[PDB]
Ligand binder design. Structure first.
Ligand SMILES: CC(=O)SCCNC(=O)CCNC(=O)[C@H](O)C(C)(C)COP(=O)(O)OP(=O)(O)OC[C@H]1O[C@@H](n2cnc3c(N)ncnc32)[C@H](O)[C@@H]1OP(=O)(O)O
Ligand SMILES: CC(=O)SCCNC(=O)CCNC(=O)[C@H](O)C(C)(C)COP(=O)(O)OP(=O)(O)OC[C@H]1O[C@@H](n2cnc3c(N)ncnc32)[C@H](O)[C@@H]1OP(=O)(O)O
Ligand SMILES: CC(=O)SCCNC(=O)CCNC(=O)[C@H](O)C(C)(C)COP(=O)(O)OP(=O)(O)OC[C@H]1O[C@@H](n2cnc3c(N)ncnc32)[C@H](O)[C@@H]1OP(=O)(O)O
Ligand SMILES: CC(=O)N[C@H]1[C@@H](OP(=O)(O)OP(=O)(O)OC[C@H]2O[C@@H](n3ccc(=O)[nH]c3=O)[C@H](O)[C@@H]2O)O[C@H](CO)[C@@H](O)[C@@H]1O
Ligand SMILES: CC(=O)N[C@H]1[C@@H](OP(=O)(O)OP(=O)(O)OC[C@H]2O[C@@H](n3ccc(=O)[nH]c3=O)[C@H](O)[C@@H]2O)O[C@H](CO)[C@@H](O)[C@@H]1O
Ligand SMILES: CC(=O)N[C@H]1[C@@H](OP(=O)(O)OP(=O)(O)OC[C@H]2O[C@@H](n3ccc(=O)[nH]c3=O)[C@H](O)[C@@H]2O)O[C@H](CO)[C@@H](O)[C@@H]1O
Ligand SMILES: [Mg+2]
Ligand SMILES: [Mg+2]
Ligand SMILES: [Mg+2]
Ligand SMILES: [Mg+2]
Lengths: 474, 474, 474
């Protein structure tokens, strides 16, 4: 049995944000959410998040994740950020006084941390009967991290913080990941002996290592080769680095599963996105939220999709869209804007400079150019001519349009809702449609063409046009 | 004299694709095509591709390349993938039984392999009178590759496959490139002695090394410092890595020749693309197929061009286009879509939200905004007003429009083909042009403006508009 | 007291450009301009730029920077590029013959060089009373650079040029940065003894080191750990590398100050750009020139902004724009084109496929779709319907439109300037507005809808439309 505590009550100063650190996102999830998904996979008996003065903005997101993960997540409050050691005391207060399981401590800012690394930590801690096992790694740039002090035999003696380390300790490149397993009694005991006598003037959880070494307890440091899994995030440079690294891993997983990603460095794929076999994702693409792509699709470059379902064989190129679905075999783009509530049927087409909002568009139906579709239902195998608008707003209110199947509407038609265009109807180029159109009818409104001869010589003489026109007489 | 065999009959399982591995593209060519271009530059006497159960989809592409490279390329069939050693036996069957030239073996999945490396391999093999010379390299991550076994004197003893290697052999970082020169007799002899007694249960070409060492033949391994040249591709992660590396080399070549590429990491340049001196390519650009850019052009960011010819001094910004040509000094973009058959004359302009298909557009002519040009011929120094459409499709059929020179067509004109607009003609804003327009004439159709006074107070009271309008009385 | 000489008179052959090297830009400044900003921060007494045969195109930019930096910058002419040693003699000619301050020499192609490194160089040179102090660094790839010759005690003996170096000297990885401090007398003396007897056949400034060592003068080489600060640019590959590295540093500075940059590798930020706290910049974005972004903005991906001011809380997504301003809380994009002279008020909206030029657009006013706004003034809380055009050009001349406040103009309105639309006015869908519209009036022009029944059966039989329409009878 084990309790996991997640310390998330620090002020996050180096982020320089009014958004609490923990809540900063990479790959579709907040760091906190990443940390909690990871721990919930491990299924510990207790899971406690220690929150600080902004608990009121985080505690509710904690409940949301508790509900998603199908479990109970407690919140402990740390009313002043007196240090990671103090934070752990707060977290302990949320366990029974006689709790006898192991205590794993982790941070809310170690977003790649994964259930396997935590299970390994707990297994190791048990195998060697440690009073404390700490995870460590070794980095080229160790700046900011606690340094792991070891004798030549590899026994850990202490951890020393960046701010308290001599120039010589600072050369150490093995660092504290801030991820620990503890025997509960040993932890409580050593926490009670902590002193704020140090540079930052805090109660350091890291002191517990040297304390327990002194007591003659067993102290184990377990080295994590894959540094990324235990990398922290204290500022926005580190956040983009880990987002980038997490993204590489997500992209590689999709590649090994049969998805061709032309340029992984510029293809951002959120963690819940699924993509079918043999799809091709061109550079500059973001697939966000719960986006789902079928198999054999082309995801045209420079495409951003958030919560969009794309069926098999579809093509989605230079498109910006969200909360929409794109049927099998449909063609979308280039330069297309899908707003929430777009439903494009199989083999449909939304072409260049087309914007769709809250509209359903039947099988086989094409909106190829320069057109706005708002609040409409359009049937099957219909064609909406270029440069048209579904006028869904009269000033003051929202109005609906219904277009039948096999319709051909002429270029530059304005559908002034509410209006219904019957099956097989046509609308001439340049029509303002204010009344219903019966099935099979032609609707027109433009007046007759009138050619005014010699207008150019008479109203624009001797413009380049008047001269060209005079040459044409000959 | 030398015969080159290219083994391309394996199943490509780790690609997880219904597209045969060899046929996967980087930089405008299939890997197979890359491998064959490289070999054909070397001009060997015989060149044989060993194909497997999907030979019917590859053999024809082989003929295409034979025809392009001006040479004969034979195909040998391997009806079951029994191993690289077995594959080479298949390839040999396509040589005369008394062939006495050297045999070079290579894979169809080593797409950076180049004629210089192959010529070096053949020269070395000859200089040392080896029975077999194998190319090797050394990598940070040797996973998947055969390991090169050498005594402390650097003599090669054997090659051992990833799957058959002890944990200790796996530490070796010098790997088999899968690129060999053989004395024909030595090869035939050693191939006949191969055994399927190993992890993968195949006839390994790699065993030939240890076999010939045992026979007391001369065995040479030649180390290739530039690893990329001999890197293989077994899955889509490795394919994107080599595409990325190949792309860096193509971009650097254009840079050293006088082309400023703002961000090489995001500029994808196919191998046949040519670009003139002092052009600037902004980030996010792909130049594909047989695209040709003149000198002093600007290739606006986020541009994708496939088979597009761009003359000197042109500007092509945020544009998506294919099979089109863009004259000297023309301006295209931002947000412009060129479909096949676009011909934009010198100093022409295709502006924002303009889409052109199958149209010729004369010198000096401008289509600046929000417009669709389909199946049209437009003369010189003409201006097409904003928000216009060449209505090229009547329902049921494709129709053509001809526009003269020095024309000025008004905004929101619909050209309902087939129609001809004479030289120097104008068309008022809002015109639906259904009849020919004589040179120098003004064509109009919109009815007269009618101002209905007090409509807002009476039909939208006291909307914000009614209130504003009531304030304006005062 | 110290004089800084900047050698910028070489021919820049390896750039293969008709644009003089020095004038090639990264991050919004020419390399020369970068070098001069850096030196002017140091505030030396004299600053002299040595120019060559293209002095006439550079000398004026030098005056511009002199004027911006609030100082005097002299130009010395080198009429033939006889070598860096000869160049320095030219530069000296612009100092009094009795000048007694230190001479710092630097290149015009070391664009990351910074005032701190130069101050350190001068302090070191003084601390050790050197006759010459040279800056050096150590690189993985030392190709092209002079090699630093040192005895085992670390005393510098000489510098040897790439072209004159034995294969063994070429293994040296410590290189000359081309950045020197000199005692003036020692420099003049050693320059007079230079010989053109070497591969390139030039007067090498680098020979001065071995000369002064021989004289028994003190010679100091000061090692710069951060190589980038002293990296040179001789060709366009090196220029993109340093632009990339400079960009990383600019982006990291904004990140540490509170700006979330999703993908630093694809976010290009010029050196004068400022960005407020908690803004988010999505991938593919360039912020150029004097662009200024407020706090809490979203800079939608694929956005390019040059000299654009964006207020707080604004959103700017998939937008291409320049010389424009975007008010607090405004929404711009996706797919929007801002031309010079755009002023979008607070809470304004410019939506998808909208292009604006030289127009002022009041608080709260919305141009949501498919529309061109040219040469217009539009008041507050107005709405411009979809697919509209401000027709600002009559053929021959530029015309202005004024639109009041709280106006609602219908879709597909053409504003044929000059025209004024009064407060609270409406314009029906499909209107060509040629006359002024009074406050509160409705302007229309389209003719009445006419439904021609059975047109489809009679003019398109038995098209799919005729069949659908016949089915609808039942
Ligand atoms: C998206 C693209 O880029 S192309 C795709 C979608 N399409 C289009 O714009 C197709 C547009 N085509 C048109 O508007 C055409 O003029 C068509 C199909 C309606 C005209 O068909 P037509 O049969 O050739 O001539 P027709 O004589 O039958 O039409 C009869 C009546 O309507 C009129 N009329 C025809 N088109 C229009 C129009 N666009 N506006 C106003 N009136 C019109 C006539 O003037 C005629 O009336 P009348 O009997 O007073 O003369
Ligand atoms: C792309 C851009 O953003 S701008 C570029 C391209 N251009 C345009 O849209 C320019 C548009 N301009 C127009 O339509 C203008 O009204 C112009 C140039 C035709 C009007 O010119 P005008 O000479 O000022 O007035 P004019 O009195 O001569 O025209 C005469 C006839 O056609 C009419 N007419 C003029 N413009 C139109 C029109 N757009 N629609 C219908 N009828 C019109 C009159 O009502 C007049 O007929 P009448 O004699 O019954 O009165
Ligand atoms: C941007 C978007 O996607 S939506 C946003 C901006 N908006 C729009 O396009 C809103 C467009 N709406 C329209 O054009 C509408 O027809 C409205 C609001 C003007 C019509 O309002 P209405 O009050 O319903 O009918 P109404 O009877 O009052 O208008 C009266 C007169 O003008 C006419 N008329 C109305 N709209 C138009 C029009 N678009 N073109 C020509 N004439 C028109 C009538 O035919 C009537 O004249 P009459 O008295 O001969 O019959
Ligand atoms: C003294 C200490 O522990 N330092 C460790 C901490 O450094 P680091 O400087 O990263 O410590 P932080 O400031 O990030 O705080 C640790 C975490 O605990 C929480 N918190 C912090 C302070 C507090 O008073 N209350 C509270 O709840 C914060 O949410 C934070 O996420 O993690 C590093 C790895 O990431 C380790 O190398 C360091 O050894
Ligand atoms: C046993 C063997 O040779 N392994 C080599 C092979 O590994 P690797 O595991 O890459 O070998 P592959 O599975 O790629 O097969 C080699 C190539 O030969 C062809 N093929 C393969 C099997 C077959 O039965 N018939 C056939 O024609 C395939 O098209 C393939 O392209 O290349 C590596 C470098 O890339 C080398 O380091 C390995 O030493
Ligand atoms: C002989 C010499 O000095 N070589 C140095 C030079 O190499 P490198 O080959 O880069 O020297 P360059 O050709 O760049 O010339 C140096 C600079 O001086 C100016 N110039 C050059 C030649 C001339 O006749 N007149 C003139 O004014 C040029 O503007 C140029 O910017 O810089 C390198 C670092 O960047 C150093 O490692 C080399 O030791
Ligand atoms: Mg931290
Ligand atoms: Mg009309
Ligand atoms: Mg392989
Ligand atoms: Mg240089």
């Amino acid at each position: 049995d084990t309790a996991v505590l997640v310390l998330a009550a620090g002020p996050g100063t180096r982020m320089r944000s009014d958004t609490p650190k923990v809540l900063h996102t990479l790959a579709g999830r907040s760091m906190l959410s990443h940390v909690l998904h990871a721990i919930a996979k491990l299924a510990p008996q207790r899971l406690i998040v220690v929150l600080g003065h902004d608990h009121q903005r985080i505690a509710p997101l904690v409940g949301e994740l508790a509900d998603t993960l199908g479990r109970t997540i407690d919140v402990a409050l740390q009313d002043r950020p007196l240090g990671t050691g103090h934070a752990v005391l707060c977290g302990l207060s949320a366990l029974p006084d006689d709790y006898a399981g192991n205590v794993v401590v982790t941070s809310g800012d170690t977003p790649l941390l994964d259930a396997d690394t935590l299970a390994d930590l707990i297994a190791t801690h048990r195998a060697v009967s440690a009073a404390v096992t700490v995870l460590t790694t070794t980095l080229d740039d160790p700046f900011g991290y606690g340094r792991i002090l070891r004798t030549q035999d590899h026994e850990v003696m202490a951890i020393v913080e960046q701010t308290d380390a001599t120039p010589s300790q600072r050369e150490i490149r093995e660092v504290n990941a801030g991820v620990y397993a503890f025997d509960i009694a040993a932890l409580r005991s050593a926490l009670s002996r902590l002193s704020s006598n140090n540079a930052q003037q805090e109660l350091y959880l890291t002191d517990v290592i040297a304390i327990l070494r002194s007591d003659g307890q067993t102290v184990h440091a377990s080295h994590v080769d894959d540094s990324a899994l235990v990398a922290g995030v204290n500022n926005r440079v580190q956040l983009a680095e880990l987002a980038s690294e997490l993204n590489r891993r997500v992209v590689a997983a999709h590649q090994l599963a049969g998805v061709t990603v032309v340029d992984p460095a510029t293809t951002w794929i959120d963690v819940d996105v699924t993509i079918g076999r043999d799809t091709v994702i061109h550079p500059g693409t973001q697939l966000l939220g719960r986006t789902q792509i079928g198999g054999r699709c082309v995801v045209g470059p420079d495409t951003t999709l958030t919560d969009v379902a794309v069926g098999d064989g579809a093509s989605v190129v230079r498109t910006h869209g969200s909360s929409s679905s794109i049927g099998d075999g449909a063609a979308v783009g280039p330069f297309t804007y899908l707003r929430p509530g777009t439903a494009l049927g199989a083999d449909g087409k939304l072409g260049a400079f087309v914007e769709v909002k809250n509209s359903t568009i039947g099988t086989g139906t094409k909106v190829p150019h320069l057109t706005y579709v708002g609040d409409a239902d359009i049937g099957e195998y219909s064609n909406i001519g270029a440069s048209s608008v579904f006028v869904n707003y009269d000033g003051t209110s929202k109005r609906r349009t219904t277009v039948g199947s096999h319709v051909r509407t002429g270029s530059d038609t304005m559908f002034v809702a509410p209006v219904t265009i019957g099956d097989g109807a046509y609308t001439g180029a340049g029509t303002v449609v204010r009344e219903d159109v019966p099935p099979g009818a032609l609707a027109v409104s433009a007046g007759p063409q009138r050619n005014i001869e010699n207008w150019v010589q008479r109203k624009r003489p001797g413009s380049p046009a008047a001269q060209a026109s005079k040459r044409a007489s000959e």
